[PDB]
Amino acid sequence: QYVWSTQVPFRVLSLKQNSFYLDVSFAETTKRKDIFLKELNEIDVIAVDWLKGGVPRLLTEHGYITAHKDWVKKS
Amino acid sequence: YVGASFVPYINWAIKDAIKRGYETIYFISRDGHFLKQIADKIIEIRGYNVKTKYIYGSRKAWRLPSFITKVDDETFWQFGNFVGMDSFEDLVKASYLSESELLSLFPEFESLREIAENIRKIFKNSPAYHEKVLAIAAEKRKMVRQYIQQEINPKEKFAFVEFWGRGYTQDTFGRLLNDAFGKEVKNPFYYVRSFTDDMGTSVRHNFILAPQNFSFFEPIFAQTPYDSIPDYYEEKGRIEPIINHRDRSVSDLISEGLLKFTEDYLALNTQDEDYFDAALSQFNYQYQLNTPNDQFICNVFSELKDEKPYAPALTLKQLESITSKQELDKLTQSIPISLSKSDVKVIDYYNKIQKNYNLPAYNSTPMRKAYAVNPLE
Amino acid sequence: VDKTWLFGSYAWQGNPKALFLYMLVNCKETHECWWVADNEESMKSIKKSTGLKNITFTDSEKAKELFPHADVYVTENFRESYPVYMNENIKVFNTWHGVGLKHIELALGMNSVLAESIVRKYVRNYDIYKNNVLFLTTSQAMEDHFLEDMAISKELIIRGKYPRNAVYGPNGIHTYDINTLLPKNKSQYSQTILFCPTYRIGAIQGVLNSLLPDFAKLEEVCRHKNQLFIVKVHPFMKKDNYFAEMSEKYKDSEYILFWNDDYDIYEAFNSIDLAIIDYSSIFYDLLDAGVEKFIRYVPDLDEYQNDDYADLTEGRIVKSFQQLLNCLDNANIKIISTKRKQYLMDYFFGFKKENKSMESLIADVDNCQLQPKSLKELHTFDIFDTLIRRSTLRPFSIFDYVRDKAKASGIKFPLALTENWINVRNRAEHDVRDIMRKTTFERQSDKIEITLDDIYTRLQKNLLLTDEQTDFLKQAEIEAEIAHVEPIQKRINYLFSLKAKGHDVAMASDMYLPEDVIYKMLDRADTRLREIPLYLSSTIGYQKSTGKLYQHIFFDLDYQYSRWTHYGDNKHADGSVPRRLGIQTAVHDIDDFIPFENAMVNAMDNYNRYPAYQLATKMHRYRTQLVQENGFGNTLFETKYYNYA
Ligand SMILES: [Mg+2]
């Protein structure tokens, strides 16, 4: 259920309105509230950083976004 | 508990001094009573070749005279003489000067009968104050120099054994040594730990190399059967410390226990006595510093009069009367122990008020006795 | 209405307020002017006290309507935050809060009490500061001083007068009648004196009590001369109990009036004949408002001495309260000399005499053209577990290794040292750290970072070790740290891709190892890393954990960046703390074992702990490759990892 690639960077389309997090933890305090990823917009992913468990996070110049297939889609 | 806390340390210190070539070990006032008893017992049993002597003194009796040619800037720092003032009497006492004689120079000070920082600054800015303090110090230094000259043999290779401190008192005492013997006198102090590097003639041998704070053990030493040495006096043409005695019961039992423990401890079948000293010390200090709900740390240690207890139990209304950590420190010297000794309703009220009043978070459980449970009568 | 101007500040004051009123009067047809307060209650207070209707507040629906398409935003400071919906091309008309010869803004450096706030402000809003701020300068001297102390574009300068010193004149703007605040009409004193002292640091007794001890004698000497003595102390000074006591004792005095700060004192400057000042910038404002009789009441000139105040300030000198009384009664204070007023006015507000007007200022602003420049970004990187990692994962593995070498070398060591090396060394390090933290006075420095040499010096001096033992142990630890280096290649390549995009990149690491050991480790991970700037805590003495290393980086670089991003593994040093400094962070997770690997490593004694670290790290590498390199599913990964481990 996770969208990612070993080859970075790579473009992704935001299926839903996606928030930016400044920490792979996705803790509330790290979620940006000044700006977001608009629905149906594309964005480059410049790194893929993995939690201690097994869930990937897609880094953009504004912070992390989810990799869940319901929210992003590789272009 | 007190044997594990003291005896291994004194053993290490005695063996380390024998190793370094020290001929005499001096124990300084108050803290050195029990420690010298322990060291004498150890030397008796083990038959070590080293002398022990006892020296009377204190911060009050040694700081002012230590000002040979200058008043230390430390006097005006966070740990100087104007540190710890709670009332106007405290300020007048830290000033060294009487209320009248002081307010004569600082009329602005007549009020209040941050603040401490500004007081320290205004003190620092007066050269006349510096020179007057220097005169008073040179005058009070006569008796201290004579006491040193009469009590300490300078032609030996000697050391001093303390317990805990920053190391500034050791520096002032080394300055007094140099002034009294007229040469660069190496003074090594043994500590359990100190926060400062070697400075000048002060050398520092530390037992435990870990970021632990041993002020924790001050109450035990405060059971020594006499007050802190305020100053000296002269009679029979000899200098003697002013000793205002206290009751001997507590110190009697403490020394009984310490010597019993020394006997039992030197009899242990160890493969490496230094390693066992180190290991037992590590375990015991860790435990006593991180076990606030221990039966005996709760029922004995924290109940020692320092006259008010060190960290007594707390009542609900006492917590209703507090709003800051400052107000609570006036009530106890160990919030964890006091809470581990207080009723569950008191603990719950503390939890209720801590998030707001910005008090330390209580992360322990009430103390449960382990041996001699319930009233034995 | 063609243009739209908003005006903002933390209070109803200053050049923002002056220009706002002057435009709401004399520019109702060419400009739409609004005042954005910081909250709702501020707007309510302004509207109740002044009756205006063009007042909104931040994040108000009126503000959310105006800011997206406004034309100018007037301010008296480099604000700490700007509305996120503020228009891209807005013109930030920064009409400063005073002129003088004191350093400000970036010149305050890392020692300033406002260091954190400055770093946050600039890191956040450097783009706005550099490409949209038109800073108002009043003279060539002041323009040069401000350009030295600030990061403003020389091309966007606006030259002219201070609106708050030229708008509330006799026939000018007034939101209140001065006579309604005074015991008698302004013509009902022989003259008026305005006392404007400054908040002095070390104040045993209240700053006011030290300057004006006996108010009874002051009032007597003012009655004798029929003067109105108006006291406007510093803001903090109003908190002292002596201030309120003296204000109540003379709440209904005919000559001593404690100015009600709810009113802008600048509006009343034209009514002030005498000014008793010390070291405040308001003096120049008064000089610009027309005042001409000055008393420099500087009892504390002893402090500021031993370090020119004489040449750039006017006013007869008075250092004692008795002298001030003798001066107020004697009535021997002449108007500033024509040559001296010409001198000071040139030096400080020269661009005024250029026949500058308010409408001239508004024209210079409006007719300005923003020619912005695209700015580069700054990217700092943690080293350990961000750009490089350890072949045994856990840091303590190193210590394990070192111990194993000590015990195997043949050099005899104390049992306590060998058997307990982990605890010995880690606790000695933390001991040295606590020593540094507790000896900031003894060292007269706030730096508290330790070095490997400190740790091993502590160990040697307090364990009575030979130079052979100590050097063996230290070199073993260094060589082991070097030999266990592995690169985190993806982040290294991303760092160098950033650099190749034209951004500036650097490394900021908290570590005790010497700089040369760090560079050897980096070189073994990737040679390119040797060419990247390095902020090593051991070399500098400041750490990311305290945030001081970030401040050092901010003040050390020629900060010209549109954005600052920090990549790291520490939720605090590389996350919380930098974010507090306004830095965008990308915080990843550190490598770590899972239950089986952890239990395996934790189950070993000294003989078997290092190989257990090796095997657990191999298992971690294997499951990492399976999940995050080969991209296998859950069942396949689980099968492979089980069959292996
Ligand atoms: Mg790291």
Residue numbers in the entry:
A (entry chain A): 1041 to 1115
B (entry chain B): 650 to 762, 770 to 962, 970 to 1040
C (entry chain A): 0 to 306, 312 to 649
How does the study describe this entry?
Supported by biochemical studies and comprehensive 2D nuclear magnetic resonance, our data explain how the ribofuranosyltransferase CriT, the phosphatase CrpP, the ribitol-phosphate transferase CroT and a polymer-binding domain function as a unique multi-enzyme assembly. The Bcs3 protomers build into a physiological and functional head-to-tail dimer, which is assembled primarily by interactions between CriT from one protomer and CroT’/CrpP’ from the neighbor protomer, with an overall basket-like shape. CroT transfers ribitol-phosphate from CDP-ribitol, generating a phosphodiester bond with the 3-OH of the nonreducing end ribose of the Hib polymer.
To study the location of Hib capsule polymer in Bcs3, crystals were soaked with oligomer fractions having a narrowed degree of polymerization (DP). Bcs3-DP2 crystallized in the P 1 21 1 space group, with four molecules in the asymmetric unit. The overall architecture between Bcs3-CMP and Bcs3-DP2 is essentially preserved. However, we observed more flexibility for the CroT domain in Bcs3-DP2 than for the CroT domain in Bcs3-CMP. DP2 is clearly visible in the electron density maps and is present in all four Bcs3 molecules bound to an SH3b domain (residues 1,037–1,115), with the nonreducing end facing toward the active centers in the main groove. The SH3b domain in Bcs3-DP2 revealed a completely conserved fold—a compact β-barrel, formed by two anti-parallel, three-stranded β-sheets. Notably, Bcs32–1093 and Bcs32–1068, in which the SH3b domain is disrupted, were completely inactive, strongly supporting the mechanistic role of the SH3b domain for Hib capsule polymer recognition.
